[PDB]
Scaffold this active site. Structure first.
Site, PDB file in Angstrom:
ATOM      1  N   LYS A  17     -27.422  53.104 -18.096  1.00 50.50           N
ATOM      2  CA  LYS A  17     -26.309  52.249 -18.506  1.00 50.50           C
ATOM      3  C   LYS A  17     -25.378  52.911 -19.526  1.00 50.50           C
ATOM      4  O   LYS A  17     -24.154  52.834 -19.388  1.00 50.50           O
ATOM      5  CB  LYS A  17     -26.826  50.907 -19.039  1.00 50.50           C
ATOM      6  CG  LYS A  17     -25.770  49.808 -19.080  1.00 50.50           C
ATOM      7  CD  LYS A  17     -26.343  48.493 -19.582  1.00 50.50           C
ATOM      8  CE  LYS A  17     -25.297  47.388 -19.524  1.00 50.50           C
ATOM      9  NZ  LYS A  17     -25.811  46.097 -20.061  1.00 50.50           N
ATOM     10  N   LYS A  36     -33.554  61.117 -23.978  1.00 51.73           N
ATOM     11  CA  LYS A  36     -32.573  60.123 -23.560  1.00 51.73           C
ATOM     12  C   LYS A  36     -31.292  60.310 -24.362  1.00 51.73           C
ATOM     13  O   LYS A  36     -31.310  60.291 -25.596  1.00 51.73           O
ATOM     14  CB  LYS A  36     -33.127  58.713 -23.762  1.00 51.73           C
ATOM     15  CG  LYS A  36     -32.519  57.651 -22.863  1.00 51.73           C
ATOM     16  CD  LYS A  36     -33.097  56.286 -23.199  1.00 51.73           C
ATOM     17  CE  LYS A  36     -32.996  55.324 -22.031  1.00 51.73           C
ATOM     18  NZ  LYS A  36     -33.942  55.652 -20.926  1.00 51.73           N
ATOM     19  N   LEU A  84     -38.533  60.771 -26.242  1.00 50.30           N
ATOM     20  CA  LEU A  84     -39.433  59.834 -25.574  1.00 50.30           C
ATOM     21  C   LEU A  84     -40.578  60.510 -24.828  1.00 50.30           C
ATOM     22  O   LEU A  84     -40.458  61.650 -24.372  1.00 50.30           O
ATOM     23  CB  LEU A  84     -38.643  58.953 -24.597  1.00 50.30           C
ATOM     24  CG  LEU A  84     -37.649  57.930 -25.153  1.00 50.30           C
ATOM     25  CD1 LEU A  84     -36.646  57.536 -24.079  1.00 50.30           C
ATOM     26  CD2 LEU A  84     -38.363  56.701 -25.703  1.00 50.30           C
ATOM     27  N   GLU A  85     -41.686  59.782 -24.706  1.00 54.63           N
ATOM     28  CA  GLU A  85     -42.827  60.195 -23.898  1.00 54.63           C
ATOM     29  C   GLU A  85     -42.400  60.367 -22.443  1.00 54.63           C
ATOM     30  O   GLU A  85     -41.674  59.529 -21.907  1.00 54.63           O
ATOM     31  CB  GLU A  85     -43.937  59.144 -24.006  1.00 54.63           C
ATOM     32  CG  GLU A  85     -45.189  59.423 -23.180  1.00 54.63           C
ATOM     33  CD  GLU A  85     -46.167  58.256 -23.172  1.00 54.63           C
ATOM     34  OE1 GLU A  85     -47.155  58.321 -22.410  1.00 54.63           O
ATOM     35  OE2 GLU A  85     -45.956  57.277 -23.921  1.00 54.63           O
ATOM     36  N   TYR A  86     -42.833  61.459 -21.818  1.00 56.96           N
ATOM     37  CA  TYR A  86     -42.591  61.670 -20.392  1.00 56.96           C
ATOM     38  C   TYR A  86     -43.733  61.108 -19.548  1.00 56.96           C
ATOM     39  O   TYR A  86     -44.907  61.373 -19.815  1.00 56.96           O
ATOM     40  CB  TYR A  86     -42.363  63.155 -20.070  1.00 56.96           C
ATOM     41  CG  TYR A  86     -42.255  63.445 -18.584  1.00 56.96           C
ATOM     42  CD1 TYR A  86     -43.219  64.212 -17.930  1.00 56.96           C
ATOM     43  CD2 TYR A  86     -41.198  62.932 -17.829  1.00 56.96           C
ATOM     44  CE1 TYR A  86     -43.127  64.474 -16.560  1.00 56.96           C
ATOM     45  CE2 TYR A  86     -41.098  63.186 -16.461  1.00 56.96           C
ATOM     46  CZ  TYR A  86     -42.064  63.956 -15.835  1.00 56.96           C
ATOM     47  OH  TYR A  86     -41.963  64.205 -14.484  1.00 56.96           O
ATOM     48  N   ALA A  87     -43.372  60.330 -18.533  1.00 57.73           N
ATOM     49  CA  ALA A  87     -44.341  59.756 -17.608  1.00 57.73           C
ATOM     50  C   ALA A  87     -44.263  60.477 -16.259  1.00 57.73           C
ATOM     51  O   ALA A  87     -43.292  60.306 -15.518  1.00 57.73           O
ATOM     52  CB  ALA A  87     -44.094  58.266 -17.445  1.00 57.73           C
ATOM     53  N   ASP A 130     -37.673  39.631 -20.885  1.00 54.88           N
ATOM     54  CA  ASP A 130     -38.046  39.837 -19.481  1.00 54.88           C
ATOM     55  C   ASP A 130     -38.512  41.264 -19.190  1.00 54.88           C
ATOM     56  O   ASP A 130     -38.041  42.220 -19.813  1.00 54.88           O
ATOM     57  CB  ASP A 130     -36.883  39.468 -18.554  1.00 54.88           C
ATOM     58  CG  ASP A 130     -35.582  40.137 -18.956  1.00 54.88           C
ATOM     59  OD1 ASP A 130     -35.024  39.762 -20.008  1.00 54.88           O
ATOM     60  OD2 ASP A 130     -35.117  41.031 -18.220  1.00 54.88           O
ATOM     61  N   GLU A 134     -38.924  48.382 -12.654  1.00 52.93           N
ATOM     62  CA  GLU A 134     -38.244  49.674 -12.805  1.00 52.93           C
ATOM     63  C   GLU A 134     -38.345  50.232 -14.229  1.00 52.93           C
ATOM     64  O   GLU A 134     -38.154  51.431 -14.444  1.00 52.93           O
ATOM     65  CB  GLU A 134     -36.779  49.604 -12.351  1.00 52.93           C
ATOM     66  CG  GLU A 134     -35.977  48.417 -12.873  1.00 52.93           C
ATOM     67  CD  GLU A 134     -35.893  47.278 -11.870  1.00 52.93           C
ATOM     68  OE1 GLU A 134     -34.763  46.916 -11.482  1.00 52.93           O
ATOM     69  OE2 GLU A 134     -36.951  46.756 -11.460  1.00 52.93           O
TER      70      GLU A 134
END
Ligand SMILES: CCCCNC(=O)c1cccc(NC(=O)CCCCCNc2ncnc3[nH]cnc23)c1
Length: 245
Positions: A17, A36, A84-87, A130, A134
């Site tokens: 976004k 990010k 950030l953590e990489y998945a 919520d 995704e």
């Protein structure tokens, strides 16, 4: 005091976004991570610059195996960077599309992991809105990780959002249904019909949804937010107990 030149940049992971996310390596540690990149001008146009700062401040204190870790954050002049953590195993949404549906074991285990993460934050006075599939990422161990900016699509919104502590309980009901069935329970061909389904809590189970699963989902998907099955009660649910790993 992180800078951009502390990182080697790899492949783009996806467009978002307010910017992009990339696979990256921290130069000193050789640690694989996700960087990010968010543009300040886009954040200013939406008017969420202060909201992001408050969001990032909350996430920097959250340490749970089922919440995506924010290692740190920095900026230069035009961009905001999140370390950030990489998945490695991608999104739960993609996994769901590939398999079409999850079995009872995988579903109950994912719900347990979600409930655990949400219960951890609840003790720290942190609430979530919520939950979308995704925004659920998978680690090397096959564990789900909450990866969004909801710490404080219509198909995933509770009746009160179309609201405070009980939104995530509706989300658990929607997710449990979608994991087992392959589609969200209030899916419809038009916006108006989808709206009506949610507001009137009009959903049905296909024949393959077992009674234990139906019981869990029905106790979760209530219009009355205060009467929804709570995180403690979800973890204590007979179907969850029997099927979770
Ligand atoms: C709520 C608004 C704020 C923002 N988010 C964004 O603007 C935004 C920016 C870039 C990308 C996205 N999301 C997306 O593009 C979602 C698609 C999934 C991309 C794969 N992402 C990751 N795969 C593996 N490990 C990770 N660790 C962190 N991300 C990942 C979103």
């Amino acid at each position: 005091q992180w800078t951009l030149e502390d990182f080697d940049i790899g492949r783009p992971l996806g467009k978002g976004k307010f910017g992009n996310v990339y696979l990256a390596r921290e130069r000193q540690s050789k640690f694989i991570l996700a960087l990010k990149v968010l543009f300040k001008t886009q954040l200013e146009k939406a008017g969420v610059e202060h909201q992001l700062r408050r969001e990032v401040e909350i996430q920097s204190h959250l340490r749970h195996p089922n919440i995506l870790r924010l290692y740190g954050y920095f900026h230069d002049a035009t961009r905001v960077y999140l370390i950030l953590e990489y998945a490695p195993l991608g999104t739960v949404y993609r996994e769901l599309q590939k398999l079409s549906r999850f079995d009872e074991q995988r579903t109950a285990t994912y719900i347990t992991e979600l409930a655990n993460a949400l219960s951890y934050c609840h003790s720290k006075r942190v609430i979530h809105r919520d939950i979308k599939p995704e925004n659920l990422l998978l680690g090397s161990n096959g564990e789900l990780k909450i990866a969004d900016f909801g710490w404080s699509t219509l198909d995933y919104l509770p009746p009160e959002m179309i609201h405070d502590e009980k939104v995530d309980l509706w989300s658990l009901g929607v997710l449990c249904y979608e994991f087992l069935v392959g589609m969200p329970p209030f899916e419809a061909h038009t916006y108006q019909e989808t709206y009506r389904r949610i507001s009137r809590v009009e959903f049905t189970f296909p024949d393959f949804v077992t009674e234990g699963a139906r019981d869990l989902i029905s106790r979760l998907l209530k219009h009355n937010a205060s009467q929804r099955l709570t995180l403690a009660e979800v973890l204590e649910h007979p179907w969850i107990k029997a099927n979770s790993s």
